[PDB]
Amino acid sequence: DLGKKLLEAARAGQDDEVRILLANGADVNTADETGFTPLHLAAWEGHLGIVEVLLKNGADVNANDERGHTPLHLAAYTGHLEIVEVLLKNGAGVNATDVIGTAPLHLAAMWGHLEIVEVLLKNGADVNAQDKFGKTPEDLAKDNGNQWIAQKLEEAKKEDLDRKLLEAARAGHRDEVEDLIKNGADVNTADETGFTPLHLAAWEGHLGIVEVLLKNGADVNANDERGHTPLHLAAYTGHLEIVEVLLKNGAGVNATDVIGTAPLHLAAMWGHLEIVEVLLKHGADVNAQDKFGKTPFDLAIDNGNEDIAEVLQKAA
């Protein structure tokens, strides 16, 4: 009956009695009739001291009860922020669900535990997880009156939809892009360096996605942190058909980055003759110097692109 005495001590919060019982051979993973273990109970009542002890003595951080509740489900239910951080620390399942489909984030967002919510998200909690009733954490927050947590969850949702749109744009998944847009993703979002979905599509040469993004209000002249526009990226990677659509949709043909390089500079240095001819036809300044002083002609000569040098020398 050591199991009963360990369950009791864990619930009451008797730190020493927990150690005395474990030392005398108590099974750290015993369970009452419903399925709660010594860890479940210590997490339900908030005894951080016994939590750390039990984990250190071989407790299963992810034990389930009859209804599929885990220790993390409980600590998130009772608002004990310190215990949640430690359960995750030992490999607790941030997205473990119960028979109803409820995850810890459903619980921390239903009982107004702002800190626990942002801690769960940082560890990978899914804001779009739906329970058996079709409720996400954001739905339960609005049903109870936690409006700040609801906004935070909305923020994380848009943050996640934007990341997906950037990746879909890079990878060339026209279907995912168009659906992400129809779900409210910002076509103008930007990663840490300032690349928008239209930057990535032009860089990778996915013409179909360039067109879609532009038809949905994408900033054709958006600048990354280095001052590059999508046209800069299409010109130097050599995607002729994208350059034409970009220019047809308002692309500044004389945009300059932090180094003072225009698209013509990049097309001439990388040796894309057709794009050089198209840029000139659309108004590119043939004589433009970058901050170091080089013209596109000098860059073509530097790289042995004689055809390009000829065309630039004639347009000058």
Author numbering: 13 to 328
What is the paper's account of this structure, in its own sentences?
In this paper, we present a strategy to fuse specific, high-affinity protein binders to obtain multivalent or multispecific scaffolds of predetermined geometry. DARPins are used as building blocks to confer the desired specificity to the construct. A series of rigid connector modules replacing the DARPin capping repeats allow to combine the individual DARPin domains in such a way that their distance and angle can be altered to test different geometries, bringing the binding partners of the DARPins into a defined spatial arrangement. The two helices are not just joined end-to-end, but instead the two domains are made to overlap in such a way that the joining helix is stabilized by contacts with the domain cores along its entire length.
